[PDB]
Protein backbone atom coordinates (compact mmCIF):
# COMPACT_ATOMS: atom_id res chain seq x y z
CA UNK A 1 0.00 0.00 0.00
CA UNK A 2 2.98 2.38 0.26
CA UNK A 3 6.39 2.62 -1.15
CA UNK A 4 9.31 0.51 0.68
CA UNK A 5 10.58 3.22 3.36
CA UNK A 6 13.43 5.37 2.17
CA UNK A 7 16.98 5.82 3.26
CA UNK A 8 16.36 8.91 5.32
CA UNK A 9 12.71 7.56 6.72
CA UNK A 10 14.42 3.98 7.58
CA UNK A 11 14.25 3.42 11.64
CA UNK A 12 11.34 6.34 11.81
CA UNK A 13 7.36 5.48 12.73
CA UNK A 14 5.33 5.83 10.41
CA UNK A 15 2.63 8.25 11.25
CA UNK A 16 -0.56 8.52 9.72
CA UNK A 17 -2.52 11.83 9.24
CA UNK A 18 -6.37 12.83 8.20
CA UNK A 19 -7.06 15.85 6.15
CA UNK A 20 -10.61 17.40 6.97
CA UNK A 21 -11.36 18.70 10.44
CA UNK A 22 -7.79 17.44 11.21
CA UNK A 23 -5.58 19.45 9.99
CA UNK A 24 -8.41 21.74 7.88
CA UNK A 25 -11.87 22.85 6.70
CA UNK A 26 -13.38 23.58 4.11
CA UNK A 27 -16.67 24.35 2.69
CA UNK A 28 -18.96 25.56 -0.88
CA UNK A 29 -19.72 28.85 0.84
CA UNK A 30 -17.40 31.50 -0.03
CA UNK A 31 -15.71 33.59 2.84
CA UNK A 32 -13.22 36.02 2.69
CA UNK A 33 -11.07 34.35 5.45
CA UNK A 34 -9.62 31.54 3.25
CA UNK A 35 -6.37 30.20 3.11
CA UNK A 36 -7.08 28.53 -0.17
CA UNK A 37 -9.29 28.69 -3.12
CA UNK A 38 -9.50 25.38 -4.77
CA UNK A 39 -11.56 24.58 -7.96
CA UNK A 40 -13.10 21.55 -8.23
CA UNK A 41 -14.92 20.60 -11.31
CA UNK A 42 -18.41 18.40 -9.97
CA UNK A 43 -20.08 15.83 -12.38
CA UNK A 44 -18.39 18.18 -15.02
CA UNK A 45 -19.44 21.33 -13.71
CA UNK A 46 -16.65 23.57 -11.16
CA UNK A 47 -17.29 24.50 -7.60
CA UNK A 48 -15.26 26.84 -5.68
CA UNK A 49 -13.61 25.26 -2.47
CA UNK A 50 -12.73 27.18 0.36
CA UNK A 51 -10.17 25.74 2.45
CA UNK A 52 -8.88 27.33 6.29
CA UNK A 53 -5.68 25.74 7.72
CA UNK A 54 -5.53 24.67 11.70
CA UNK A 55 -3.50 26.72 13.83
CA UNK A 56 -0.12 25.86 13.84
CA UNK A 57 -0.07 23.12 11.14
CA UNK A 58 2.53 24.38 9.15
CA UNK A 59 4.84 24.60 11.98
CA UNK A 60 3.31 21.00 13.32
CA UNK A 61 3.75 19.40 9.71
CA UNK A 62 7.66 20.71 9.80
CA UNK A 63 8.50 19.09 12.98
CA UNK A 64 6.94 15.73 12.39
CA UNK A 65 8.69 15.51 9.01
CA UNK A 66 11.69 16.06 11.08
CA UNK A 67 10.80 12.90 13.25
CA UNK A 68 9.04 10.76 11.15
CA UNK A 69 7.76 9.18 8.21
CA UNK A 70 4.66 11.07 7.76
CA UNK A 71 1.61 9.72 5.28
CA UNK A 72 -1.78 11.36 4.26
CA UNK A 73 -4.54 8.46 4.72
CA UNK A 74 -8.02 10.35 3.66
CA UNK A 75 -11.37 9.00 2.89
CA UNK A 76 -11.79 11.84 0.81
CA UNK A 77 -11.71 11.49 -3.09
CA UNK A 78 -8.71 12.61 -4.62
CA UNK A 79 -9.14 15.04 -6.91
CA UNK A 80 -10.24 17.23 -3.86
CA UNK A 81 -7.60 15.79 -1.26
CA UNK A 82 -4.82 16.08 -4.04
CA UNK A 83 -5.52 19.74 -4.60
CA UNK A 84 -6.00 20.26 -1.15
CA UNK A 85 -2.84 18.39 0.05
CA UNK A 86 -0.45 20.41 -2.44
CA UNK A 87 -1.37 23.71 -1.24
CA UNK A 88 -1.36 22.37 2.49
CA UNK A 89 1.88 20.88 2.45
CA UNK A 90 4.22 23.76 1.40
CA UNK A 91 7.29 21.90 2.87
CA UNK A 92 6.54 18.21 1.11
CA UNK A 93 6.34 16.82 4.39
CA UNK A 94 4.07 13.86 3.34
CA UNK A 95 6.03 10.62 1.69
CA UNK A 96 2.64 8.78 0.12
CA UNK A 97 -1.05 10.13 -0.10
CA UNK A 98 -3.38 7.40 0.08
CA UNK A 99 -6.91 7.94 -0.74
CA UNK A 100 -11.35 6.50 -0.08
CA UNK A 101 -9.89 3.59 -2.32
CA UNK A 102 -7.26 2.58 -0.06
CA UNK A 103 -9.82 2.43 2.89
CA UNK A 104 -12.23 -0.40 3.26
CA UNK A 105 -15.72 -0.12 3.74
CA UNK A 106 -16.92 -1.27 7.10
CA UNK A 107 -21.24 -0.57 6.28
CA UNK A 108 -20.70 2.93 5.00
CA UNK A 109 -17.80 4.03 7.03
CA UNK A 110 -14.58 3.72 5.42
CA UNK A 111 -11.65 2.49 8.00
CA UNK A 112 -8.02 2.69 7.71
CA UNK A 113 -6.79 -0.52 7.56
CA UNK A 114 -3.51 -0.21 9.18
CA UNK A 115 -2.38 -3.45 8.13
CA UNK A 116 -2.37 -2.83 4.92
CA UNK A 117 0.21 -0.30 4.48
CA UNK A 118 3.36 -2.61 4.77
CA UNK A 119 4.86 -1.09 7.62
CA UNK A 120 5.41 -2.73 11.59
CA UNK A 121 1.98 -1.59 13.33
CA UNK A 122 4.47 -1.72 16.31
CA UNK A 123 5.87 1.29 14.66
CA UNK A 124 3.02 2.70 13.11
CA UNK A 125 0.79 6.00 14.90
CA UNK A 126 -2.48 7.15 13.53
CA UNK A 127 -3.62 10.96 13.88
CA UNK A 128 -7.48 11.35 12.95
CA UNK A 129 -10.17 13.03 14.58
CA UNK A 130 -12.80 10.53 13.72
CA UNK A 131 -12.50 6.80 15.37
CA UNK A 132 -14.28 5.11 13.06
CA UNK A 133 -11.30 5.62 10.90
CA UNK A 134 -9.50 3.54 12.93
CA UNK A 135 -11.99 0.87 14.11
CA UNK A 136 -8.97 -1.77 13.59
CA UNK A 137 -6.30 -0.03 15.68
CA UNK A 138 -7.37 1.73 18.41
CA UNK A 139 -4.37 1.12 19.95
CA UNK A 140 -2.49 2.95 17.31
CA UNK A 141 -4.45 6.00 17.60
CA UNK A 142 -3.92 9.20 19.18
CA UNK A 143 -7.11 11.15 18.94
CA UNK A 144 -7.34 14.49 17.97
CA UNK A 145 -10.36 16.97 18.49
CA UNK A 146 -12.33 18.50 15.47
CA UNK A 147 -11.53 21.61 13.84
CA UNK A 148 -13.37 23.86 11.89
CA UNK A 149 -13.03 27.59 12.62
CA UNK A 150 -11.65 28.50 15.53
CA UNK A 151 -8.97 30.37 15.20
CA UNK A 152 -7.42 30.62 18.80
CA UNK A 153 -7.24 26.21 18.67
CA UNK A 154 -3.85 25.22 19.54
CA UNK A 155 -4.05 21.34 19.18
CA UNK A 156 -1.35 21.05 17.02
CA UNK A 157 0.89 23.14 18.89
CA UNK A 158 0.10 20.97 22.31
CA UNK A 159 0.35 17.60 20.34
CA UNK A 160 4.35 18.29 19.36
CA UNK A 161 5.60 17.67 22.81
CA UNK A 162 3.54 14.40 22.62
CA UNK A 163 5.08 13.15 19.21
CA UNK A 164 8.53 14.62 20.49
CA UNK A 165 8.13 12.42 23.25
CA UNK A 166 6.76 9.40 21.23
CA UNK A 167 9.31 9.66 18.09
CA UNK A 168 12.49 7.80 19.36
CA UNK A 169 10.00 4.72 20.73
CA UNK A 170 10.67 0.75 19.79
CA UNK A 171 6.96 -0.18 20.27
CA UNK A 172 4.15 2.69 20.50
CA UNK A 173 1.84 0.46 22.27
CA UNK A 174 4.50 0.68 25.60
CA UNK A 175 5.15 4.14 25.01
CA UNK A 176 1.51 5.35 24.58
CA UNK A 177 0.78 3.53 27.92
CA UNK A 178 3.82 5.51 29.64
CA UNK A 179 2.47 8.57 27.73
CA UNK A 180 -0.93 8.15 29.49
CA UNK A 181 0.19 7.11 32.95
MG1 LIG B 1 -11.37 13.64 9.38
Known sequence: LLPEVTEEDQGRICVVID???T???SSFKPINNADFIVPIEIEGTTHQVYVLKRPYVDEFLRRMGELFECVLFTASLAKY???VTDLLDRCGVFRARLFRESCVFHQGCYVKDLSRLGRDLRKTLILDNSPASYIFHPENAVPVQSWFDDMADTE?????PIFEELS???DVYTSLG???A
Open 156 to 160: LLNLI
Open 81 to 83: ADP
Open 23 to 25: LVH
Open 168 to 170: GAE
Open 19 to 21: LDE
Open 178 to 180: QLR
